[PDB]
Design a protein around this ligand. Structure first.
Ligand SMILES: *[C@@H]1O[C@H](CO)[C@@H](O)[C@H](O)[C@H]1NC(C)=O
Lengths: 145, 144, 143
């Protein structure tokens, strides 16, 4: 019964170690049987959820004196615990086939068990370009299985 | 009971055409019409599509992109809104000419769909899309 | 209760289909069985099956990676293709010092009878990074 799909991808928090923020109202964005708080999908009904997130990614250059790669991730928060558990993580960049401005896309999807009160957040690590389209192309939702 | 569908195969044309009956292609509670998935029952659907891309070019490197998306056609406004969209750099100058490259774009998400509404899969420069295997390129959905 | 399963990446001991964790942490089997890398269908029906694999390397071999979900009936030897993707995460002319990472996700609805198996196979699994069960996993659920 419960499900949700969010878009928006406010990247204002990522710099200071915060998760992405998402629209829950406008357009295809919706909450049904789930809650939302400060970028987190809050679970109301306990059980197995198929969680998913897609992140549209951009880059202005692709060199590696050291290394440039992006880390897309779905994480679990348990309110009484300081730790954000890695649930579904992808390490990604088309820089593997590079020698330039680029596009890439990260999809994460998986069935995880969630409890009432637990939250799920999306973090994108080391992003260097946010196009006007990134917020709406990127999305993050789930549905109870 | 629950409506579900998985469309194998592929062909070129805007929208992409799909197989419906042959092989892993199936329709249960869902309809299909000329590159478009048609809904019978209203409700929330996890729709998905994977597109296999391949070529022997890519002069423009990572600047050469591929847009792959799911689009909903509605009568509330006779237009298509892009729902789930993926734009990727499928290759770069790292692959020489006369050398094959591959890439794959997956999309999946939950949208609300009324009865009679249609969803198509569209890809920028379908000249690169590789139809030949339906396991490599497919488009399906299922209600939540 | 709706059958579901999520298997996490474990050290695969080139060696055939990938092996998975089924109990520890994010790994679980509910209504679904497991046997030597294969998810086993106990209750016939339609399943959304999914698999993600994390790929990474230094420089580049050759290099095209094939990531695929396959089906097999324990009576018959052949494994039928279900969901396959081909990627070229690196080029033969990329910097030999370039450390690259690319993820491959596959998801799709398939019909499965009772007793049938679903496996994940990757061409050059040496390029698969199974350090994290969060980076490489394989799950499914009945629709
Ligand atoms: C991101 O969120 C903060 C707090 O609501 C807001 O000040 C800022 O304008 C937002 N950015 C965008 C583009 O939505």
């Amino acid at each position: 019964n419960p499900a949700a799909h969010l878009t928006g991808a406010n990247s204002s928090l990522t710099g200071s170690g915060g998760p992405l923020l998402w629209e829950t109202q406008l357009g295809l964005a919706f909450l049904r049987g789930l809650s939302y708080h400060d970028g987190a999908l809050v679970v109301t009904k306990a059980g197995y959820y198929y969680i998913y997130s897609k992140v549209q990614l951009g880059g202005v250059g692709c060199p590696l004196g050291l290394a440039s790669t992006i880390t897309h991730g779905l994480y679990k928060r348990t309110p009484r615990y300081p730790e954000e558990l890695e649930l579904l993580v992808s390490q990604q960049s088309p820089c593997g086939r590079a020698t330039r401005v680029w596009w890439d896309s990260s999809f994460l999807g998986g069935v995880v068990h969630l409890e009432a009160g637990e939250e799920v957040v999306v973090r994108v690590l080391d992003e260097r370009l946010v196009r006007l389209r990134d917020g709406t192309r990127s999305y993050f939702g789930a549905f109870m299985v």
